[PDB]
Design a binder for this molecule. Structure first.
Ligand code: HEM
Ligand code: HEM
Ligand code: HEM
Ligand code: HEM
Ligand code: HEM
Ligand code: HEM
Lengths: 140, 140, 140, 140, 140, 140, 140, 140, 140, 140
């Protein structure tokens, strides 16, 4: 009797994450990333460079917390077509939603010039992703 | 006693999706796609090209979220003649409705010249397809 | 005790479909098809040709949704003489009513010159066929 | 306790069909068939010919829906002497009443010159034959 | 407790059929047959001939619905001395009362010159024979 | 292990009957029947007549031993496609091959004017039909 | 251990039938049918006509022994992709190969004007179809 | 112990089909199809037309025996990565290799203008596809 | 006792594929792809274009048969650290090695300008990938 | 009796890897990496840059195939003190030896300026690491 509630909660979390991903919120380019994080890129001699860390909070921006937008929305699309009545599908898509966040900007690696990335800890996407990952945590 | 409710819900979702697909809503050609998505095709040197991304929301338009109209309506027709009292048919047609959405427009691939495509995240078709995919998620 | 209700519902749906097929409703020749679908056939160079698509809804007219009238009415006649108390007969005749709809008009294939075809998504036949296919979806 | 009701219903349906067959209703020769169905036989070049279809309803007249009167009344006579308490006899005589309807008039095959035929979808015989075929659909 | 009722009903039906057969009702010679059926015999070239059919109801007169009076009354006499408490006797004598009706007059075969025949569908014998054949349809 | 031998024997008998029916042997019209049977038709007063019996052997020609050629060859065709590993199919097609023989010529009924009939006791067809009917007599 | 042999025999029979159907052998139009069967079509008054029967063997040509070439080769193609290890597939495709033979030429119905038909008892196709129908007759 | 042999045979058949598909053999365009099949396209009045059938062998070319080359080679690629130790995968990929053959050229529908098609009954591909479909027929 | 052999075979196939991937064989850029496949890219007006197909073999080059080299070698690295004694790991890494091949060049989509891709049907990599995918097909 | 052999093989592989890691073989800095891989770093505008790929083999150098030397030798030290008689320890340390290889040089990320990295596919370390990962693949 709890599997139905688990399925409904999973679907609701996926739909809310999809609603916010459609509007594009939580997606950053180089400009928005370096502006909102306060990280300034200095291009030392000659082919490398580095970000100037001013507060430790910026370290969150340099963690494994970025995913490709197309990959993430495709993951949502394919997840909506799963048998969440089963524990196996829940485990698999939970691991998929957890592992999709990879690092892109680092202390010595500048944010990509033209690509966009999805921030795991964006103020709007963070609660949705947290509730989504928590919705799979229901066993029988 | 829940299999009957699952069957009725599945049939209702299929009927609603069919009702909206008959009117052609959610179907895009190159003109309507590039108009509603805001994506402008620039023809870089020389035989290729790319879409100009102005907001990250447009990434949803470039995901795996497009299906052939004839294939989709034939899928609906053939799905309406299944024994949804069985779990096997539910799983199979759920996978069919989930995998019918493939990518067609990409960052370096312009929308097809003359063909039409069905948008998974069209404002009208999105809730119907979501409810349809969720209706199969009922096990015994 | 539900098999009796399933049998009665199946028989009623078959009888209603028969009543509307007898009156000839939902049957199209080349003239009526090209008139009601708005598809105009242009005879391009030189021995072939194509239909001019003006709205995407017309794609439903070009799907696998056409059946021979005599074949369909014979299917109904022979189906009325089945043991629908059994699940096997229900499954078999459901598959028969689902697979009888084949494609005939296409974008590059004109509607047959003299034959008649039954439209799966005719405004009158659509609910009858839907209710018929749903009546077989009852198991024990 | 339902086998008695099934037997009584089967016998009542057979008796009603017999009552209407005794009066000769639903029997057509070439003249009455081609007059009441509106099908006009045109003798194309040179030794053959075809019926001219003016409305699609006429297709019902060209289906597998004709039986020999003597064969049908003999089937009724022999059916009245069966043990309908058994499911096997019900199934067998249901198949017999279903297979007695064969095609005689076709698009390229004219109605027989002198014989008479019984119309499965005659306005009077249709409900009786339908109820008869449905009366056998009772299991225990 | 139902076998006694079945036996009593069978005996009552046999007694009623016997009562009407004793009076000779439902027995026809060539004169009475050709008078009551309206069938007129024309002697075509040269040693044969045929009946002139004026209405299709007459076809019932030419079916397998005729029995020898002596054979039928002997069948009744011997049937009254059976153990109808058993299902076997019921089945056997039901088949005997069903198979006694054979064809004798046909479209191209005139009624026998001097013999008498019993008409299965005589207005008086029809309900009695029907009720008799139906009385055997009782199992335990 | 005996059902395989029974199946092979049944198929061989059906094939032999088919081979001899293809050549048309054992098929009679009025001329060949009245010539080979020695029965002479005298046209007594006035529209009827009778055959003049000269030897009692001719009585075999007047028994229930005639079948329509097309019906018989169709019976063979459909019988070749049965599951004779099962007892049910063997019993059913045995009864079908036994009941197809009906009477046509009688002492007071001349052979049909234009039709053909198959003689059950034709010198060639008799052993084939006998072996066929005997091949089904194998049970477990 | 016998199911493997049954499967191999079924596949071999289907392959041989396909090999001979590819070359078109056993396929007849009106000219070849009326030439090889000896049946001469006389166009009686006025839009109909009849075949002149000279020997009873010709009745085989007028039986239910004709199939559409495209339908038959499609049946073979789809049958080659079945699980013949199962009895169900064997029974079903045996019934399909048995029922594909329908009547087309009759005594009062001339061979179709332009279509082609496959002769069930053609000298080359007869043994292949017989062996095919017999190969399915293996149960456990 | 037989599942290993079945798997090896399946893999060998898939590899052989891939070997011949890589070289492109058995693939036809409009030119090669109309040249090797002998079918000549006449452009009747006015926007349609038809193929002129000169021998019945050409009917094989007009059956459901054509597949897209890219779809077929992708099917082979994905099939090579299955767990053929299981019966389910064997059944599924057998159905996939059986259903990939669809009709494209018809009597009134010319071969596609620019596309290519794979001929199920090409002299080289026919035995390979037959052996492939037959290799899956191994159960326990 | 067969799981050890299965593990050893899997490891040997992975090591051979790794040996050939280290040398870079089977990797193509735009130049090598368009040179070895014979496909010539024409840049029609204005932002799109197409490849000119000269033989059907080239269709293999346009299928879903390309993988990123880094992704493929990382897949090999991670696969070498699995518990192939278990069936689950075998199934998972088999599906991973089967699904890693995606399409990149198409008829209307030119090969990427600067990236490299791994050809599934390269003359050297094809047997190794086939043997690798077949090595996982061993169950207990 | 196989767990002892598995333990001995695991310990031997760890000892061989340790023997080669002590001598420092397979460890690269920026100079040795860019010398042995042939990858030349070009400093595009302005603070970033990229490696110039001349042959596809170099892609192996840019995969997830690098580990910190101290982390790897500490992993070996701590692994030598495990209870490899248990399956759990084998699985865990196998995953540890598989996941220690991470990417460090990328197409747009130059090799670290002063740190050292251990190359998974070094000519000497490759067989040792492969045999080590394979030694854990023994279950009971
Ligand atoms: C018992 C649990 C089973 C599960 C979880 C299962 C799962 C699946 C899945 C995931 C598919 C793919 C559907 C798609 O790609 O759209 C499928 C297809 C299929 N399965 Fe099963 N299956 C089961 C049992 C069976 C069995 C026992 C049979 C046959 C004996 C069977 C027959 C088929 C067939 C014929 C298809 C192909 C349907 C199509 O045309 O796409 N299934 N099944
Ligand atoms: C137990 C589960 C069974 C299932 C799910 C099943 C399913 C099917 C299906 C899907 C068809 C095809 C219907 C069509 O294409 O219109 C069919 C046909 C058929 N089956 Fe079964 N079947 C079962 C058992 C059996 C058995 C055990 C037998 C015989 C011993 C049988 C006899 C037949 C026959 C004779 C047909 C042909 C019906 C026709 O003429 O169209 N079935 N069945
Ligand atoms: C147990 C399940 C059985 C089923 C589902 C079954 C089914 C059928 C069917 C479908 C027919 C064809 C009826 C027609 O074509 O109108 C038939 C006929 C027949 N069956 Fe069975 N049968 C069963 C048992 C048996 C058995 C065990 C026997 C004999 C030992 C038997 C004897 C016959 C006979 C004699 C006929 C011929 C009826 C006629 O003349 O039309 N049946 N049965
Ligand atoms: C158990 C189920 C049985 C059934 C369904 C059955 C069925 C039949 C049928 C259909 C007839 C032919 C009736 C007619 O043509 O008028 C008959 C006659 C007969 N049966 Fe049975 N039978 C059964 C058992 C038996 C047994 C076990 C015996 C003997 C040990 C037996 C002895 C006879 C006899 C002697 C006749 C001849 C009746 C006559 O002279 O007309 N029956 N039965
Ligand atoms: C018992 C039967 C099982 C079957 C038939 C099965 C089937 C599958 C399939 C088809 C995949 C997809 C692999 C891919 O897409 O590459 C998968 C992945 C996976 N399964 Fe299972 N599974 C089973 C048991 C389990 C169990 C019991 C667990 C965990 C308790 C599990 C954990 C996983 C995980 C973590 C993945 C993700 C692998 C990846 O990263 O791609 N599996 N499984
Ligand atoms: C019975 C089957 C079991 C399996 C297949 C299994 C599998 C695994 C796996 C895959 C890891 C990850 C290793 C890594 O990331 O390097 C792990 C770690 C671990 N497991 Fe298990 N486990 C099992 C049972 C248990 C149980 C019952 C316990 C404790 C009661 C346990 C205690 C641990 C611990 C403490 C770790 C952390 C090791 C570390 O420091 O990385 N395991 N196990």
């Amino acid at each position: 009797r709890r599997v139905d509630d688990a399925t409904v909660a999973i679907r609701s979390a996926i739909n809310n994450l999809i609603v916010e991903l459609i509007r594009g919120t939580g997606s950053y380019n180089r400009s928005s990333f370096e502006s909102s994080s306060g990280l300034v890129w200095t291009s030392g001699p000659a082919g490398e460079g580095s970000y100037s860390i001013t507060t430790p909070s910026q370290f969150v921006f340099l963690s494994s917390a970025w995913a490709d937008p197309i990959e993430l929305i495709n993951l949502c699309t394919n997840a909506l077509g799963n048998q969440f009545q089963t524990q196996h599908a829940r485990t698999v898509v939970q691991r998929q939603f957890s592992e999709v966040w990879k690092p892109s900007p680092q202390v010595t690696v500048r944010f990509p010039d033209s690509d966009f990335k999805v921030y795991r800890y964006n103020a709007v996407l963070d609660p949705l992703v947290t509730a989504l990952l928590g919705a799979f945590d229901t066993r029988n």
